């Protein structure tokens, strides 16, 4: 059933995943010296290419590949159109490794055919709370705690094969080469997400959506008008009214995050993320990188009253190409990123996210039910979508956890 994934150090079934008590590696210990120095073999008509994702023109070449060939829905109505500025942000965080950005080109004429990208993350990925209690009940604490320390691992994203090269087994070769390049830097685990079900997720969450421009969402068929609204004289007017928002934020002291906020936003975020079983650890440099405002890419606001920052939220932008329509070419989506509330309820903080995103011309706000995102779904009028996001590890046994015990946002 999985000619590639059955060869890899990942749990092969749910049954297997059910026997997993403790976090730890799946493969035997190996060293950098054990890993092939030479690139993985590839057909003589292709070549490996390492783009420089801080050079405008190489970011542009990867941007076109993804614009034309990255994830689309099954009805081929929407395809992600991550921007060039977003891709430099996402793939060049502090201490990134250029060699973990891996592309395939056709040698003759240099057509770009495939891509995959790794970036560093420091991740808490030790045994989860409910399995540390089982370990205590059995006298097994020391082996449950072995990998408690945050680990410096690889986060994988942006795997893409050009549509003309699909179903030719190119994705496994690009995954093997990325694994080799990561293992040559003495890193042996990765985390990744996907919509598709592969062997074998450690957590899965549904997507949720909050309409901000319901008339446009209906016009492009992201949304339909729900059947009850047909009982009204003007179903669309009622739908618009349902989802209307204030025109300015309600929290006193909301303002954009500045460099001087980085230590306090790091402290409140890290204290909050500590509470989840799987989550990132960020340095001040990574808080700066991932959360300071960047035009068209990431939007972050703090609540400061009387000189103290007590709360913050962030969202990022991923537009999609609207493939069929005549009135619109683009879907402008805001995604809930990290946040922390210490002075107000989470729903009150996230209402201001929706207000600012709507003011800035976003059409929808999306999120997965990770973090404490379930706590504001109903009041803020999010609905579940049909998608999901599955969380995976490479070379790491891990017990199944609920998505409300995951604190890693994947872009």
Ligand X SMILES: CN1CCC(N(C)c2nc(N(C)CCC#N)c3sccc3n2)CC1
Contact residues for 137 (Cβ-Cβ < 8 A; gap 6+) = none
Phi, psi of 314 (to 5 degrees): -140, 150
Per the CB < 8 A criterion, the answer to whether 114 and 162 are in contact is yes
> Of ligand MYA, Mg ion, ligand X, none, which one does residue 156 interact with (CB within 5 to 8 Å by kind)?
ligand MYA
Q: Check residue 393 for interaction with ligand X (CB under 6 A).
A: no
Q: Closest distance between ligand MYA and the C-beta of residue 168, in Å?
A: 6
- The SS3 assignment for 364 reads strand
d(CA 396, CA 9): 8
| C-alpha to C-alpha distance for 100 and 15, rounded to whole angstroms | 33
Three-state secondary structure call for residue 49: strand
Residues forming the active site: 411
Q: Per rule CB under 6 A, is residue 323 in the interface with ligand X?
A: no
**Quick one: which segment of 68-76, 167-175, 318-326, 342-350 binds Mg ion (CB under 5 A)?**
167-175
Q: Which stretch binds Mg ion (CB under 5 A): 2-10, 159-167, 315-323, 375-383?
A: 159-167
CB 350 within 8 Å of CB 322: no
- Binding part of the chain for ligand X, among 47-55, 130-138, 301-309, 382-390 by CB under 6 A, reads 382-390
Strand pairing category for 190-194 and 151-161: parallel
Asked if 410 touches ligand X (CB under 6 A), the answer is: yes
Tokens of 220: 């492009």
Helical ranges in 186-323 per DSSP H: 214-219, 235-242, 262-273, 284-291
Contact footprint for ligand MYA (CB under 6 A):
2-5, 69-71, 154, 156-161, 166-172, 175, 178-179, 182-183, 187-190, 192, 194, 196, 198, 394-395
Q: Is 264 in the site for ligand X (CB under 6 A)?
A: no
CA 188-191-193 angle, to 5 degrees, is 150
Q: Note whether 200 binds ligand X by CB under 6 A.
A: no
**Residues between 141 and 170 that touch ligand X (CB under 6 A):** 157
* 62 to 81: interface string for ligand X, x by CB under 6 A: ---------xxx----xxx-
Give the residues lining the site for Mg ion (CB under 5 A).
161, 168, 170
- Residues forming contacts to ligand X in the complex (CB under 6 A) are 71-73, 78-80, 157, 193-195, 207, 222, 318, 320, 331, 333, 364, 366, 385-387, 389, 410
């Amino acid at each position: 059933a999985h000619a590639f994934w059955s060869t890899q150090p990942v749990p092969q079934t749910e049954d297997e995943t059910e026997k997993i008590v403790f976090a730890g590696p799946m493969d035997e210990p190996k060293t950098v010296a054990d890993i092939p120095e030479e690139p993985y073999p590839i057909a003589s008509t292709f070549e490996w290419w390492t783009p420089n994702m801080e050079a405008a023109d190489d970011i542009h070449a990867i941007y076109e590949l993804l614009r034309d060939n990255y994830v689309e829905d099954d009805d081929s109505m929407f395809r992600f159109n991550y921007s060039e500025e977003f891709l430099q942000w996402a793939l060049c965080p502090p201490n990134y490794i250029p060699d973990w950005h891996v592309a395939v080109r056709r040698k003759a004429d240099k057509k770009l055919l495939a891509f995959i990208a790794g970036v560093p993350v420091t991740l808490r990925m030790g045994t989860p709370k409910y399995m540390k209690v089982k370990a205590q009940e059995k006298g097994e604490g020391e082996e449950a705690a072995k990998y408690d320390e945050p680990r410096h691992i690889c986060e994988i994203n942006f795997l893409c094969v050009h549509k003309q090269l699909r179903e030719k087994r190119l994705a496994p070769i690009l995954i093997k080469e990325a694994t080799r390049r990561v293992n040559r830097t003495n890193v042996w685990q990765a985390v990744y997400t996907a919509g598709v079900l592969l062997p074998t997720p450690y957590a899965s969450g549904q997507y949720f959506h909050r309409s901000l421009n319901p008339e446009k969402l209906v016009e492009i068929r992201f949304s339909g008008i729900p059947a009850q609204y047909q009982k009204f004289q003007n179903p669309m007017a009622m739908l618009k009214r349902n989802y209307q928002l204030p025109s300015a934020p309600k929290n006193s002291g909301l303002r954009e995050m500045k460099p001087s906020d980085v230590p306090q936003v790091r402290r409140i975020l890290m204290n909050y993320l500590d509470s989840f079983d799987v989550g990132p650890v960020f340095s001040d440099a990574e808080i700066s990188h991932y959360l300071l405002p960047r035009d068209g890419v990431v939007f972050t606001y703090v609540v400061e009253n009387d000189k103290k920052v007590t709360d913050f939220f962030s969202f990022y932008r991923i537009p999609s190409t609207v493939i069929g329509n005549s009135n619109y070419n683009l879907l402008n989506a805001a995604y809930v990123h990290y946040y922390a509330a210490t002075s107000i309820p989470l729903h009150q903080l996230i209402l201001d996210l929706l207000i600012v995103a709507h003011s800035r011309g976003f059409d929808v706000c999306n999120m997965v039910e990770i973090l404490d995102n379930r706590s504001f779904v109903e009041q803020l009028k999010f609905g579940a979508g049909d998608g999901h996001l599955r969380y995976y590890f490479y070379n790491w046994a891990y017990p199944k956890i609920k998505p409300s015990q995951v604190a890693l946002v994947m872009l």
